[PDB]
Design an enzyme around this catalytic site. Structure first.
Site, PDB file in Angstrom:
ATOM      1  N   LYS E  41       8.373 -37.923  -7.020  1.00 50.50           N
ATOM      2  CA  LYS E  41       9.008 -38.832  -6.946  1.00 50.50           C
ATOM      3  C   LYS E  41       8.295 -39.731  -7.767  1.00 50.50           C
ATOM      4  O   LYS E  41       7.589 -40.596  -7.386  1.00 50.50           O
ATOM      5  CB  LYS E  41       9.521 -39.565  -6.215  1.00 50.50           C
ATOM      6  CG  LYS E  41       8.956 -39.104  -5.105  1.00 50.50           C
ATOM      7  N   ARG E  90       6.366 -53.533  11.881  1.00 50.09           N
ATOM      8  CA  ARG E  90       7.067 -54.421  11.442  1.00 50.09           C
ATOM      9  C   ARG E  90       8.848 -54.450  11.401  1.00 50.09           C
ATOM     10  O   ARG E  90       9.245 -53.474  12.484  1.00 50.09           O
ATOM     11  CB  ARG E  90       7.372 -54.528   9.706  1.00 50.09           C
ATOM     12  CG  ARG E  90       7.557 -53.009   9.207  1.00 50.09           C
ATOM     13  CD  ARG E  90       8.249 -53.418   7.894  1.00 50.09           C
ATOM     14  NE  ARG E  90       8.840 -52.223   6.809  1.00 50.09           N
ATOM     15  CZ  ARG E  90       9.991 -51.751   6.396  1.00 50.09           C
ATOM     16  NH1 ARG E  90      11.116 -52.688   7.849  1.00 50.09           N
ATOM     17  NH2 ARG E  90      10.007 -50.339   6.157  1.00 50.09           N
ATOM     18  N   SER E 127       7.772 -52.351   1.566  1.00 50.79           N
ATOM     19  CA  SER E 127       8.100 -52.937  -0.422  1.00 50.79           C
ATOM     20  C   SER E 127      10.211 -52.778  -0.802  1.00 50.79           C
ATOM     21  O   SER E 127       9.633 -53.211  -1.835  1.00 50.79           O
ATOM     22  CB  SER E 127       7.238 -51.681  -0.760  1.00 50.79           C
ATOM     23  OG  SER E 127       5.799 -51.956  -0.061  1.00 50.79           O
TER      24      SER E 127
END
Lengths: 157, 157, 157, 157, 157, 157
Positions: E41, E90, E127
């Site tokens: 990918k 996070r 991201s």
């Protein structure tokens, strides 16, 4: 017409609390900060002290007022002709307990609870952890309003 | 005047969604249901069908309207002169992701997100799970508006 | 000859507890409700009262009995020839702690713990929250067996 | 005449799954392992292979049988005269989604779901992670039935 | 002597990542950022682009180097004579999955995983969410290093 | 030269603690176990007894030492020229509170906190639960260092 109650013990109020107050005041016509008191445990600050510290740091919020109370929060809310609670979320919030209380409060009084996450910068302060850190000399000056910090240090000394 | 946006794909709207719509409409002067559509993933119902189903279900809410949107949710909100989102919580909500998006949305556009838990009775239904159960002949009629259930049977026949 | 033990303090038993009892009684040949007594906090109800209230509320479950216990739950279970616990989950359950206890209990005595979520309608009642709300005049009658509710009113009045 | 169904895709069955099967077989008179087949993803193993691997690994459980299924799990359960599911918990279980499905399954078919945590030793294996690790040469032999492990090596080589 | 690997796809690296890199570099003699690639990918940035963006924003960290890889992380770690991973947390981290992977990685290769929470200011960037927000025009300039932001905008246009 | 502090009350030290100590000692040049003592809550073992038990258990770790402390953990850390904490995670850890403290400790003193999960075998033991089980004659000898188990029996006899 619209309005919400922001509840807590606020012993003392933190910048995490103030962030939530500000958001509530920006989104509802009136906001009441409910300083809830257990008549069987004293805490660090008296009710008048708690209220004064909140008022001094919310003077720029014309549609916010501060009142104390005890017993059922939903009675405090309904007796003021309101039926919404706005409660802050932070790191270390027991959310499962908050959810339990929210579902109970809707069941017994038809009062809705809206949760809002406090700003990241204020997400790790709590009244209890601030008091604990300050007790042992740690610097929590950036996490509390000016109306609180030195009064806190005073109580501790 | 106050206001909030209730976002989702609503494919189809459920009674969990409706419960949240009702609470938003009770607490804000204006509510906009934002039917957010994805160009890639086409669901079961067309955008027009979804809007119609929401309108049927919210007929008693005069201060709530239904609109479609694409792109950034915070732009949808700000373009309509508002800066609040009301999002429902149910069993199976990815709350950690909702929190991440709430903090992102506050950062990039100043928009607040208020979370409210749906009623226990409607806490385990979801658009996807309702469709899945109905597809295999399971009865989810107690979990959807009557007009939605009618349409769902049609799209399966 | 299958069997399971349903443990708790049941001070008092709620409809959340009863829902779990009923499911346990439906899926195991024999169920024992274990009323675990503390070294303080002495509750609102005495052990005999708690037992009677449970017995009253489970009269339609012929394969369920109610007994008090002290010491390790696994000993209670094993001394009765069983090695399964059935524990209910509700909103506000400390599931992480329940998992810790489950793994410990399997380690020290080979006793399995099966968790089952209580019905959504009864998912936000707990013995403590029901007592708190009732104390301040809130109506918890929909959340407790009718018998229990009257007894609670008696303890408060 | 008690019974429960243990559902999964089991592609392949792990020692985590087997641990749960063993506990279910120990606490219910009759256990059915339901190998639920997908509409893609077609796994690594065919349904017959998955079934044989489970049968091979449960030869010491006389009251357990293995069957394939399509459609709603609750129909699988109910068509066999049962109304209980036993589902295992491991590190990485999406418990919130499992709870949602449990409440839905109780609603639509009156089927109870009992959750049990797998043994700590087997708490971090999953069918997907075992396949991923084995694919890149990692040794997962301690985490799968010896039979299964050899078959996996065959599918890769 | 001491050292740790900081793994990820870094497509692109965020300030959340850089915070974790900085902490790792402050606490271990050497740090290797492992840019892990799925050869099946493509992602948004090529491997050389990802590495360049990291190097440009870590130039003030003399004991940090950047390398790409694929396959098992623990092989990347061990072939460099190390046996520690440092992974950031996070808002929106799937911690349960991270825990599963950490226990698997210790099992198969004896490699330890240390988790560190990224700074609150960078706690809601990822991201994927940064790419999504930027795709629809949202301002993520404060959440990404200068080495990334306009390259990201370039890719999107 | 690198270093971290491993904090706790260790009343008594468990194999879960030891596992974390070993991993810290393997990854940092210097490790200090901080036996943090509370003036109000006196546990089962004296500070000297706890230190002795940790020293017996960590005899093979030459770069680890054991010291007592009071007050602010970050002061204990900084006073020894370090600015890292290594904290273990187990089943039953209040991770949300650990995160809150980690962010507070970074804010007030620049100290980083690294979390590591203890091995599955030692993941359900805790000082408190070990004492509780042992008090009622449950066998936790597989969960504690041999010298600790010996002492625990003594304090119970």
């Amino acid at each position: 017409m619209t309005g919400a109650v922001c509840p807590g013990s606020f012993d003392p109020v933190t910048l995490g609390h103030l962030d939530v107050f500000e958001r509530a005041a920006a989104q509802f016509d009136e906001v009441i900060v409910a300083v809830l008191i257990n008549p069987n445990k004293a805490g660090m600050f008296t009710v008048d002290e708690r209220i004064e510290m909140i008022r001094e740091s919310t003077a720029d919020l014309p549609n916010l007022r501060v009142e104390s109370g005890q017993g059922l929060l939903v009675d405090f809310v309904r007796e003021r002709g309101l039926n919404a609670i706005v409660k802050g979320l932070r790191t270390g919030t027991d959310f499962e307990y908050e959810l339990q209380m929210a579902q109970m409060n809707k069941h017994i009084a038809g009062v809705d609870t809206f949760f809002v996450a406090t700003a990241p910068a204020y997400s790790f302060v709590s009244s209890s952890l601030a008091k604990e850190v300050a007790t042992y000399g740690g610097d929590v000056s950036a996490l509390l309003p000016a109306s609180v910090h030195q009064r806190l240090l005073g109580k501790l000394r």
